[PDB]
Design a protein around this ligand. Sequence first.
Ligand SMILES: Nc1nc2c(ncn2[C@@H]2O[C@@H]3COP(=O)(O)O[C@H]4[C@@H](O)[C@H](n5cnc6c(=O)[nH]c(N)nc65)O[C@@H]4COP(=O)(O)O[C@H]3[C@H]2O)c(=O)[nH]1
Ligand SMILES: Nc1nc2c(ncn2[C@@H]2O[C@@H]3COP(=O)(O)O[C@H]4[C@@H](O)[C@H](n5cnc6c(=O)[nH]c(N)nc65)O[C@@H]4COP(=O)(O)O[C@H]3[C@H]2O)c(=O)[nH]1
Lengths: 217, 216
Amino acid sequence: DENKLNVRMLSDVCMQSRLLKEALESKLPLALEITPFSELWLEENKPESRSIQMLVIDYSRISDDVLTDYSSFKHISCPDAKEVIINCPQDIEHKLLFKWNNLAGVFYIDDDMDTLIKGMSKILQDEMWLTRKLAQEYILHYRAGNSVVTSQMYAKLTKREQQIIKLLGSGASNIEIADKLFVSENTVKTHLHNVFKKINAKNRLQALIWAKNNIGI
Amino acid sequence: ENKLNVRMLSDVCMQSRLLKEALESKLPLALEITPFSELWLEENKPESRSIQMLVIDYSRISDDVLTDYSSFKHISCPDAKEVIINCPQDIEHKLLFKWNNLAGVFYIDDDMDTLIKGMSKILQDEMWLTRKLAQEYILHYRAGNSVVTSQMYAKLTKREQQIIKLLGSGASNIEIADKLFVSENTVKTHLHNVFKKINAKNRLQALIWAKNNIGI
Ligand SMILES: Nc1nc2c(ncn2[C@@H]2O[C@@H]3COP(=O)(O)O[C@H]4[C@@H](O)[C@H](n5cnc6c(=O)[nH]c(N)nc65)O[C@@H]4COP(=O)(O)O[C@H]3[C@H]2O)c(=O)[nH]1
Ligand SMILES: Nc1nc2c(ncn2[C@@H]2O[C@@H]3COP(=O)(O)O[C@H]4[C@@H](O)[C@H](n5cnc6c(=O)[nH]c(N)nc65)O[C@@H]4COP(=O)(O)O[C@H]3[C@H]2O)c(=O)[nH]1
């Protein structure tokens, strides 16, 4: 429906998902389609993807190897879409949540539907549904001048590889990188191919988008 | 009681609880949710013996939890009915026979109206099986066939096969060393290598495995 909010839920399709989809569409002015993380890469360049206004991210189906796929999907098709996490672990580390650049709300593995509908309805009115502590962490962090939280994959790279990535995620060219590290152009090309694991970049654009969101000062 | 004691093997999450609510509100049953990975903790609880139905969520199932399942079923609720949900449309019928009390299958794309319709037929002691699936049962069992040999079995070495096959007849350690003319501590050492592949925490799991996985 043209009237409704275009929402895309990253999860399995199954009895439960479809039940959830039904439950949401019943009580809120939104049109939800389900797309598994594994299939995200196929939606990246579809025209209808550009119309998503909200991603419902099912944390209980998330994994490190789908993350690069997510980041390039977000940036390519719907960078302005809000993001909402469901099934978040209670004991989750606040800074791990900061990678969701448009995080609008978090719903926890043991939240009931009363809560999901109450929160979702507030998000749809452009409110946030964040916990007090979580809110406080944002403020502390950001207000104190910090932005990106450097991920774990990065810290697992060799020195050459780190240096080469840092630059990439500043938008440097291959040749630009070569010249800053005093190295052959094909040299850096060869490191990047190694770096496309486990960052998991199917290509350069991906990695470059990975870098911008995953490696910070 | 007054309600059927149903246990659903699945993740706990928004969706699962939604499903549980949806089920409990349309049928006379009391559902609790227990994740596969956590099944071994429930194996020896008193309340596990009260389970009358297992709703097995195929989408959350893997081979490493299977031997955990078969020992749980047999120790705690061998007579409980089994009902599969989120089954792949294209699943190979023979693979389904390992559920000794299968009563119903629900497929990845079945809607709730179908879930409620079948569950009610099951609660009336009817089955919710596809025409072909029913047919495959008859063809197979009618022709006197029994356990379908797993893929895990076919993967281990002839030595290990021979030793397992005998275990899955209920032979002793020494009885096995003696049929294969081998050292008693030799068979013990193969079993350990097998328990790893099979995923048996112990010998009991192992032999409950062989019974359900290594006919004929
Ligand atoms: N009277 C009052 N109490 C407050 C307020 N803020 C926090 N609390 C208390 O602190 C508990 C946990 O807050 P939370 O971690 O932010 O976690 C909250 C928050 O994440 C969400 N939530 C509940 N209601 C609202 C709401 O009206 N607005 C927003 N933005 N979030 C809410 O649900 C979670 C648990 O809700 P509770 O069971 O109510 O549990 C709340 C409530 O007992 C407040 O402004 N007024
Ligand atoms: N009028 C009639 N048509 C039959 C009969 N048996 C099978 N069909 C036709 O065959 C289709 C697929 O059969 P199925 O694999 O058993 O697959 C069926 C079966 O697994 C289940 N189902 C539907 N209704 C019933 C029911 O009343 N009893 C049982 N036991 N299963 C049902 O849902 C699946 C899809 O159902 P359908 O959309 O109806 O699609 C059914 C229906 O079009 C029958 O006895 N009478």
